[PDB]
Design a protein around this nucleic acid. Structure first.
Lengths: 102, 128, 214, 131, 115, 148, 50
RNA sequence: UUAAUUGGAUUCAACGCCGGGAACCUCACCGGGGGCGACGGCAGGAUGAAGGCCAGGCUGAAGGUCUUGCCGGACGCGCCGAG
RNA sequence: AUGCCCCGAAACCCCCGGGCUACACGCGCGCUACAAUGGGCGGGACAAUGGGACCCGACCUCGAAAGGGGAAGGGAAUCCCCUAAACCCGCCCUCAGUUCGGAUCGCGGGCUGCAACUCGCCCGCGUGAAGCUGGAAUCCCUAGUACCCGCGUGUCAUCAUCGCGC
């Protein structure tokens, strides 16, 4: 057997969930065993910076963070099911990387 | 029967089955753990429960995270939940509550985030 | 590790530390009976929310309170005999496991010294090291004046415990002998009313002054 | 033996040998332990029962350290300035070598030598409020 | 007489740079191993020519990290510290140390009356 | 009984005296003159420290399976003072444990898996669980609760 | 002769995009931005305060 | 104090602050050297560069500088406004 | 961004070097250091902020070590960083300015980067300073909090005992 691992990565929660919903309904319409969406741990990239532009004032800093979420979908080999994922409307904030695994 | 234990960062997964009385901590016997206070914390939940139930069941616990204090206390928590779920004895839960409120409720306290102005020593540690 | 396993199996019958089951222990002074906890527990380490309870420190085991007062002892504005009681050498703060082992060995020393229950000696010393009067300042018309006061028993046991701990710690500090020895000497002195104890001497000096400030 | 003299430097026999050898300007705790291992004697064993044959054993150990099993690097001045080989430096010889190096840095007039001419930080240490 | 690792001035001179660097410290031998910059080689050519007698100019320089070699012994060169090219003379004892150690970049700091 | 069912310190102490007999495990000529770790401020006190190292390593190979030199440096690393700076962690020296692992391989107690480290052979497991069974039998009479 | 030497290393190898200051430049994933410049650009960058 | 320890910051509300990283750089400080004034007005122009070129003396040093001998084929020296 | 004013082959640009760390004292805040918990030997339970393509670098071998020769996997739940530390036990040393602490000197080696004596760190060596608890005075905090202990990321090749987050 063969299964495609689909990585869907986005900063926006709702667009990622929408793409996951689209893949879900695609898989359940195409009659393909699709291991449900597995959200991998969300990455929180954090950068700290002092707020005083000049050298004066008490030591005051802020931590600015980016939260990026990722989902993994294992979908069984169905070339009919694999032709239609290429028609998925991918928002600009979402990216999809599909690999094949025996 | 599977049981949980959450303490600080110590997560304990315990599984209790009928057996000779063997209890093992990540595959290690309870009596051999070199820190004595950790051994006593692990031992406490099964003392008051009774010696009969100490000899009646076998429990295997895998505890990850926290320190050896945290791991011992999470094993204690997991054993506490396992005893009540296995026996289902209200009196055991009641006397556990008398001995301690957190043996089935647990302590959801954690470490607070650190903050600017000498964060390293702590959140509230500031300059003189 | 054989005495360790022996001390691990002895207290299977709901016993504090490893031995000295507390049924034999007694409270003499009426003020400390409803404020000293003789509850049966293997360990004096509850991690409880007594800081979240106004008067929830009384429910803690007495030796747990003693372990606390031991681990609160180094460095302050508290200057006696011109000495900085400071532990720059593995400070006891937050290291409650040292504050468990050291106390266990100290209580062992008491057991082999007195031959009796060391908890009985401890309670006798607490009763003998608890003062009975103090002072306060009150002002009418801006003229201050000192008034004698009588302590609440909770603050009495607080000062007794802290004072015993400070006496032992000062004995230990910058000294050849160890801290367990210091505690073991101090509490046995306090048990039988020797002024050589810093605890009893401090009790006497704080009980006085208030004598004349009436 | 209350007083045991080795390499012309007296030591108290009450101290353990690994500690007894450290009294010499030119043996440390580590060096004392490894020369004790060279001699094969227990470093714990006190220095008061040191027969003179073991004293000479230690003397000739210090005479040529590399051949006795101590590697080439445990010495303080490997690749010695005037031989190019590895030799350990003890007491008076250390004094002469250090003075020769000081006079070397001075006669070249190095910044290191310049700071050695008056007593200042050679390796970047600061003295605004310090020293 | 002069001694360095068991070799005198001429005994050092007759040999190539490989063992000559093996006699030098780590900071000097390693830097020599990693090669010389375009302006170090040019200055070496200048001083070799001067020792031959071709380069009769009083030679000034700025390369402070220039490691003195025995071949440079017996010549006077002017090294830059930031303002001027202070004169220095190379004797046999200069071997194994940088040239930039030999120019005061900071004048003497003495103390006057406090404010 | 396995290595799990016995205290680690007692198992190491037992294994060292058995490894004493076999001649393959032997300290090199340079062992006593180098302290056990880069971080260490001192040489080890006793002269048997080499065997305790080897006896330690095998136990790790019994439990942690394929292991390399660097991870052994990290586990055997310790806390060193940096002077007026605070105390910080550092890894131990690699040559000592490399010689130890090489001698162990020459003893056959472990086998090299390239790209992963060294794992424990059937013979090493037999030696170690025989030792553990003897230790557990020894501790059973003194502590009957280990019979369970 | 009139060209600054290339620098792949050190502080001089980084000169901020916006303000051009040679000092604090965070390069997490290659922002290539000054610390004082990050305040005007963070909210538009999808950063959100929590 | 220095050539420089660049300068800023004044008790709360300056002093592990600008520096959230000084061996060239950082440089805002000092010593020394080289090079162009854009676009115009006045002036030269192909009458031959302003770009580089060896051997070298001054240059730390580099056709930068100059004796040396020259091309590459073309708009570029310079004063004022204004850069 | 930014008015006004100044200079305009300098106050423009560039090259080199020096300094940016210089000191008879004081200042603010941190790190170490003023022992017997201990110095040392072996063993053990133990995390996370996160980072990773001239990067993490597993892993093999040479070197005390920095690092030298090769290279698996990883554009990140799959591989590495990476070990956590505090701490307990079997045991030696038994209280002194030492079995503490290391400044400081010179030597050897490794790194980075054109180059680190000015102007780095580390693996070590003879080396190892004051310090045997500090005066009036005075700083901070109020529940998992204070404190102890450790860790990595950002600034970065090096440099902080910086700082942040855990």
């Amino acid at each position: 057997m063969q299964k495609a691992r689909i990585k869907i990565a986005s900063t926006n929660v709702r667009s990622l969930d929408e793409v996951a919903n689209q893949i879900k309904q695609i898989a359940e319409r195409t009659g393909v065993r699709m291991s449900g969406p597995i959200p991998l741990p969300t990455k929180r990239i954090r950068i700290t910076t002092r707020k005083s532009p000049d050298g004066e004032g008490s030591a005051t800093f802020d931590r600015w963070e980016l939260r990026v979420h990722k989902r993994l979908i294992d979908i069984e080999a169905d070339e009919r099911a694999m032709r239609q994922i290429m028609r998925i409307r991918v928002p600009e904030d979402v990216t999809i990387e599909i690999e094949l695994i025996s | 029967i599977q049981t949980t234990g959450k303490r600080k960062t110590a997560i304990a997964r315990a599984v209790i089955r009928e057996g000779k009385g063997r209890v093992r901590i990540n595959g290690k016997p309870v009596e051999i753990i070199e820190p004595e206070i950790a051994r006593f914390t692990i031992l406490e939940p099964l003392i008051l429960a009774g010696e009969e139930i100490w000899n009646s069941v076998d429990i295997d616990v895998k505890v990850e995270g926290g320190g050896f204090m945290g791991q011992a206390e999470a094993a204690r928590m997991a054993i506490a939940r396992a005893l009540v779920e296995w026996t289902g004895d209200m009196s055991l839960k009641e006397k556990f509550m008398k001995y301690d409120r957190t043996m089935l409720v647990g302590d959801p306290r954690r470490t607070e985030p650190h903050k600017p102005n000498r964060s390293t020593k702590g959140p509230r540690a500031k300059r003189q | 590790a054989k005495p360790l396993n022996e001390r691990f199996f002895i207290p299977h019958e709901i016993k504090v530390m490893g031995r000295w089951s507390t049924e034999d222990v007694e409270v003499r002074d009426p003020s400390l009976k409803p404020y000293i906890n003789l509850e049966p527990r293997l360990l004096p380490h509850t991690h409880g929310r007594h800081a979240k309870k106004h008067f929830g420190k009384a429910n803690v085991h007495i030796v747990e309170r003693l372990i606390n007062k031991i681990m609160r002892s180094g460095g302050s504005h508290y200057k006696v005999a011109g000495h900085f009681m400071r532990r720059e050498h593995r400070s006891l703060n937050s290291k409650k496991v040292k504050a468990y082992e050291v106390v266990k060995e100290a209580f062992k020393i008491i057991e082999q010294r007195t031959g009796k229950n060391p908890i009985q000696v401890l309670v006798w010393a607490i009763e003998n090291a608890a003062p009975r009067e103090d002072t306060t300042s009150v002002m009418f018309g801006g003229i201050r004046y000192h008034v004698a006061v009588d302590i609440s028993p909770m603050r009495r046991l607080d000062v007794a415990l802290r004072n015993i701990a400070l006496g032992a710690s000062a004995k230990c500090y910058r000294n050849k002998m160890s801290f367990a020895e210091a505690l073991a000497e101090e509490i046995i002195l306090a048990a039988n009313k020797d002024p050589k104890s810093y605890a009893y001497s401090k009790k006497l000096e704080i009980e006085r002054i208030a004598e004349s400030s009436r | 033996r209350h007083i045991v003299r080795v390499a012309g430097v007296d030591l108290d026999g009450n101290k353990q040998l690994r500690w007894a050898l450290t009294a010499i300007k030119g043996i440390g705790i580590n060096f004392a332990t490894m020369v004790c291992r060279v001699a094969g004697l227990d470093p714990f064993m006190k220095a008061g029962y040191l027969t003179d044959e073991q004293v000479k054993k230690i003397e000739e150990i210090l005479a040529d350290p590399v051949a006795h099993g101590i590697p080439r690097w445990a010495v303080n001045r490997p690749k010695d300035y005037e031989t190019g080989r590895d030799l350990h430096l003890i007491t008076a010889k250390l004094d002469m070598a250090i003075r020769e190096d000081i006079m070397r840095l001075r006669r070249i007039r190095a910044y290191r030598g310049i700071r050695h001419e008056l007593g200042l930080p050679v390796r970047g240490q600061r003295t605004r409020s310090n020293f | 007489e002069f001694r360095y690792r068991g070799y005198t001035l001429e005994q050092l001179m007759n040999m190539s740079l490989e063992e000559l660097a093996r006699l030098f410290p780590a900071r000097q031998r390693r830097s020599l191993k990693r090669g010389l910059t375009p302006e170090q080689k040019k200055l070496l050519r200048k001083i070799r020519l001067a020792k031959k007698g071709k380069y009769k100019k009083p030679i000034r320089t700025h390369c402070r990290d220039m490691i003195i070699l025995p071949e440079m012994v017996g010549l006077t060169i002017y090294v830059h510290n930031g303002k001027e090219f202070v004169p220095v003379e190379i004797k046999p004892e200069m071997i194994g140390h940088y040239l930039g150690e030999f120019a005061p970049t900071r004048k003497k700091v003495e103390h006057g009356a406090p404010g | 009984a396995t290595v799990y069912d016995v205290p680690g310190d007692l198992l190491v102490e037992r294994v060292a005296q058995r490894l004493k007999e076999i001649p393959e495990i032997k300290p090199p000529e340079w062992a006593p003159f180098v302290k056990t770790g880069r971080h260490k401020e001192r040489l080890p006190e006793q002269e048997d420290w080499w065997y305790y190292r080897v006896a330690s390593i095998l136990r790790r190979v019994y439990l942690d399976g394929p292991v390399g030199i660097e991870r052994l440096r990290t586990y055997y690393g310790g806390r060193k003072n940096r002077g007026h700076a605070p105390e910080k962690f550092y890894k131990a020296g690699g040559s000592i444990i490399r010689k130890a692992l090489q001698q162990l391989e020459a003893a056959g107690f472990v086998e090299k898996v390239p790209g992963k480290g060294r794992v424990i052979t059937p013979k090493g497991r037999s030696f170690l669980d025989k030792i553990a069974t003897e230790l557990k039998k020894e501790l059973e009479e003194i502590i009957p609760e280990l019979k369970k | 002769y009139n060209k600054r030497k290339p620098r792949k290393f050190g502080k001089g190898a980084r000169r901020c995009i916006r303000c051009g200051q040679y000092g604090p430049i965070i390069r997490i994933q290659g922002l290539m931005l000054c610390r004082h410049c990050f305040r005007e650009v963070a909210p538009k960058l999808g950063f959100r305060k929590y």
